[PDB]
Ligand binder design. Structure first.
Ligand code: USD
Ligand code: USD
Lengths: 304, 304
């Protein structure tokens, strides 16, 4: 028993982190096979970031200008190319620690683990979610760009995020491993404001099921609701609309606990309207939305 | 910017996890050099756990009864011994992935990362703290015994915890790597109730400094207090007493933010008396106590 904000074991990803330097800028790269992936803003000076023309800046760069170091040994760069907002540095050596991997573009509400790195070295691992406004709330200092987000399915790492920037509000923006930003963000130092950070309703419901499984049951009420009634309340509280797809995804948790999804919605509806009254659920005084229904099943069953 | 409950990168520890089976019981072991460490209750049937005599049960066990598997390859057990509540299984092969390591016994209030494992395989990593009542609030299912807690200092892993049991209240108890339980707990299936789970005051203060560094400043007030006045309030709210040692440890955070430790105590005093009023600090609606002052400095500086 017990329910924690758990990250995937990071070992498989640690074996892929390298340092990339271009001029005076050092950030992280991801070395998979004979390619090193990193944010293209590694070629920019802090000044260039104001209005960069990446194609033009890249013309002034040669393979020998990209310094790639894996541990304390230098990798030889034999090619370079830009794919959207990432640079792909072809090296002459395949990473011997390359795990089975995929590049996936996640949807909002999906969670992933981040291996925060500096100078190609791992500093920590934590669990995040792609917010509905396509930002993430991470922990990233200067030098952390190129740190990656991922999920693991037994032995295959699905990379879903690469860190590129912090908005003026302290929230984070980045790309998938094809270099496409999540959301409308651009790799430029300009006014970029995030939209409404709504709550991921299906994740809150999953976490309420995790609470019931783990013995925290005070919030269970005698009520039920409908998808339409619940959604009127969800709109009022800046919660994402709940769809029949979300109800179907919660089916296994509903089956395990014997609590119908709409009854759990009615419990959540009362928590939104009445508040927590100074009580906690799974050691939290707010409704947690960074556990997907899959994460709740995974953690409650001990998937390795 | 951003502040997350961050665990250490788990790779160095993943390379040490093995599966240990005795009879019908399978749990995890930690393989360092040519020794595999595991909870001694691996020799018990669920029935034996009611009132086990470990020395007597161990007489009926031979080296060949302890099945140790690292990945999918079997290790040969050439010796076994009991040290307090852990078994040390001498194997004929040194773990080639043994990192630099130490065995440390932590004090309450100290944090560590847990690599939850099942069948010798890592499932997830999360951050914990040794509670003042010597329990931990983990996420452990059946089969997770032998999972370990650790801290990393650059390349040296300091192992501080090995999971042994869950109390009837869903909280966890375990030992250091010398087999000595934290707190008064015993490896027996009997009535073991935990004491008061007080709040780790010095960690809350560290987290308030982390909040100021990261821009969450609404709780800063115009007041100050004394150690004695603050402690009267701390006692009332089941917070641990703050000592001059804790004030000294918070010195670097006080210096960085320009907020005197006693002024931060006065802010915390008002938060305890007035509550949060529906507001949050670092995305939390409660006062977080599982970040030490060292963790706040580490995360705010990007130690790798
Ligand atoms: C990412 N490494 C980064 N560091 C400093 C400024 C901007 N981005
Ligand atoms: C630890 N692995 C454990 N599993 C089942 C019951 C008790 N302890």
């Amino acid at each position: 028993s017990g329910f924690r904000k758990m990250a995937f074991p990071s070992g498989k990803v640690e074996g892929c982190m390298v340092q990339v330097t271009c001029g005076t800028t050092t950030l992280n790269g991801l070395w998979l096979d004979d390619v090193v992936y990193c944010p293209r803003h590694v070629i920019c000076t802090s000044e260039d970031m104001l209005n960069p023309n990446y194609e033009d800046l890249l013309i002034r760069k040669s393979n020998h200008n990209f310094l790639v170091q894996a541990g304390n040994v230098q990798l030889r760069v034999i090619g370079h190319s830009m794919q959207n907002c990432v640079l792909k540095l072809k090296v002459d050596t395949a990473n011997p620690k390359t795990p089975k991997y995929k590049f996936v573009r996640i949807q909002p509400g999906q969670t992933f683990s981040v291996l925060a790195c500096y100078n190609g070295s791992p500093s920590g691992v934590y669990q995040c979610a792609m917010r509905p406004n396509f930002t993430i709330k991470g922990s990233f200092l200067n030098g952390s760009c190129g740190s990656v987000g991922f999920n693991i399915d037994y032995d295959c790492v699905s990379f879903c995020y690469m860190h590129h920037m912090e908005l003026p509000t302290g929230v984070h923006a980045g790309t998938d491993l094809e270099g496409n930003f999540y959301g409308p963000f651009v790799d430029r130092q300009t006014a970029q404001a995030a939209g409404t950070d709504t709550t991921i309703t299906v994740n809150v419901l999953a976490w309420l099921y995790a609470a019931v499984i783990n013995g925290d049951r005070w919030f269970l009420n005698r009520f039920t609701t409908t998808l339409n009634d619940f959604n009127l309340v969800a709109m009022k509280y800046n919660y994402e609309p709940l769809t029949q797809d979300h109800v179907d995804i919660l089916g296994p948790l509903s089956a395990q606990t014997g609590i119908a999804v709409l009854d759990m919605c009615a419990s959540l509806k009362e928590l939104l309207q009445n508040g927590m009254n100074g009580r906690t659920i799974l050691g939290s005084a707010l409704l947690e939305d960074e556990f997907t229904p899959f994460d709740v099943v995974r953690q409650c069953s001990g998937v390795t």
